[PDB]
Design a protein around this ligand. Structure first.
Ligand code: NA
Length: 329
C-alpha cells in the first residue's frame, strides 16, 4: 500500500514527508492513550534536573547525579567535557546522510547492508498489528573501527566515531559517579563490561508530520540500556513521565547539552535504586528534527543482576541474574 513506497522501496517517512502529504496514513495512528498525552498540556513549572559538571567540588556533582538518577531517572549535562565542535559535526553528518539520494541509502537496509551491525530502516513497531512510529533511523552497533570502515556510510563515519570517542570518557565519569550510593568507589574491568560492554548508536530523523497529534516519534517505553545519552537538535521533543507528580514533562533542548536517563540494566544491577522510567518522542508538525542517541549497554553475554556491593549490608535481592541477550530478546 503506502508500505511499498515507504518500506519496500526504501523511501522511508522522510521522502514520504517530502511528497507534501496533507494527511497521515492509518499505519501511524497511535492508540488512544498515546493520542491523549499528546493533548496533555503541562504544569508550567516542573523540569528535569540540570547538572553542571565543570563545578570544582566534584563530590556535590556526584550526589547531584543520583539526586537526579534516583528520583527522576533523567538529567541533563551542560559542561561535560565533550568539545562542542564534535556535537555539531555529528548532527550535520546525520542530516547529510538522510539528505543523501535514496539510491545510496537503500544500501544499508537489512537486505542490502553487508553487515547486520549496520542497518538503515524505517517505521518501527515491536509487535504485530500495532501502530508504526513516524521515524527513520540508522542503527549502528559498534564492533571495531575496522567494521566501521567497511560497513558504515562514508558520509558520516568519522564524525560518528569521533563522537563515540569523545563521549566515552564523559560516560566513564558518570559511572564512577553513580557508584556512590552503590558502594562502588572505582570502575573495574568486569563491571566495565557490565556497564560499557557494548555500544550502539542510532542516527534518528523525524520529518515534519501532517497530523502530529495522531502519531508519535517514539511510543511509551523504558530503555533497556545501562544508560543512554541523548544529543538533541534545537527543537527537541522529548517527553518524560515524572515519578513525583506522575505527569509528563517536555524536555527543553539546552545550549550544548546531553540528556542522560537510565536503563533497565542499571536499574537491575542497582537492585531497584535507579529508575528506568517511561518516555516518548512527540511528533512535530512544523519542522524536521534529528536525534543522535548512544545506547550504552552491558555486553550481550553479560549476566546482569543485583551487584554484590548493593546486597552486602543485609538487603535482599529484588532480581534474578539473567542473561542480557535473553532479556532484550
Ligand atoms: Na529511549
Amino acid at each position: 500500500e503506502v508500505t511499498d513506497f515507504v518500506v519496500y522501496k526504501g523511501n522511508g517517512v522522510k521522502g514520504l514527508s517530502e511528497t507534501g502529504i496533507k494527511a497521515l496514513p492509518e499505519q501511524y495512528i497511535q492508540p488512544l492513550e498515546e493520542r491523549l498525552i499528546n493533548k496533555f498540556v503541562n504544569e508550567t513549572d516542573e523540569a528535569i534536573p540540570v547538572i553542571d559538571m565543570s563545578n570544582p567540588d566534584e563530590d556535590r556533582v556526584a550526589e547531584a547525579v543520583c539526586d537526579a538518577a534516583e528520583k527522576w531517572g533523567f538529567f541533563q549535562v551542560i559542561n561535560h567535557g565533550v568539545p562542542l565542535e564534535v556535537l555539531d559535526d555529528v548532527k550535520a553528518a546525520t542530516h547529510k546522510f538522510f539528505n543523501l539520494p535514496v539510491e545510496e541509502k537503500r544500501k544499508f537496509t537489512k537486505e542490502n547492508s553487508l553487515s547486520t551491525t549496520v542497518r538503515f530502516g524505517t517505521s518501527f513497531s515491536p509487535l504485530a498489528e500495532q501502530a508504526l512510529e513516524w521515524k527513520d533511523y540508522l542503527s549502528l552497533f559498534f564492533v571495531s573501527e575496522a567494521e566501521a570502515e567497511q560497513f558504515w556510510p562514508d558520509i558520516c563515519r568519522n564524525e560518528t566515531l569521533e563522537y563515540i570517542n569523545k563521549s566515552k570518557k564523559m560516560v566513564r565519569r558518570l559511572l564512577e559517579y553513580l557508584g556512590k550510593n552503590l558502594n562502588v568507589k572505582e570502575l573495574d574491568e568486569t563491571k566495565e563490561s557490565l556497564f560499557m560492554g557494548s555500544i550502539r548508536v542510532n542516527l534518528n530523523y523525524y520529518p515534519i508530520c501532517p497530523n502530529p497529534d495522531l502519531t508519535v516519534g517514539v511510543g511509551r517505553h523504558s530503555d533497556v540500556s545501562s544508560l543512554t545519552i541523548l544529543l538533541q537538535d534545537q527543537i527537541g521533543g522529548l517527553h518524560v513521565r515524572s515519578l513525583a507528580s506522575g505527569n509528563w514533562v517536555h524536555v527543553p533542548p539546552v545550549a550544548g547539552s546531553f540528556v542522560i536517563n537510565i536503563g533497565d540494566a542499571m536499574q537491575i544491577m542497582s537492585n531497584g535504586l535507579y529508575k528506568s522510567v517511561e518516555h516518548r518522542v512527540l511528533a512535530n508538525g512544523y519542522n524536521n528534527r534529528i536525534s543522535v542517541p548512544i545506547f550504552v549497554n552491558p555486553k550481550p553475554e553479560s549476566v546482569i543482576g543485583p551487584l554484590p556491593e548493593v546486597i552486602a549490608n543485609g538487603e535482599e535481592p529484588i532480581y534474578r541474574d539473567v542473561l542480557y541477550s535473553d532479556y532484550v530478546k
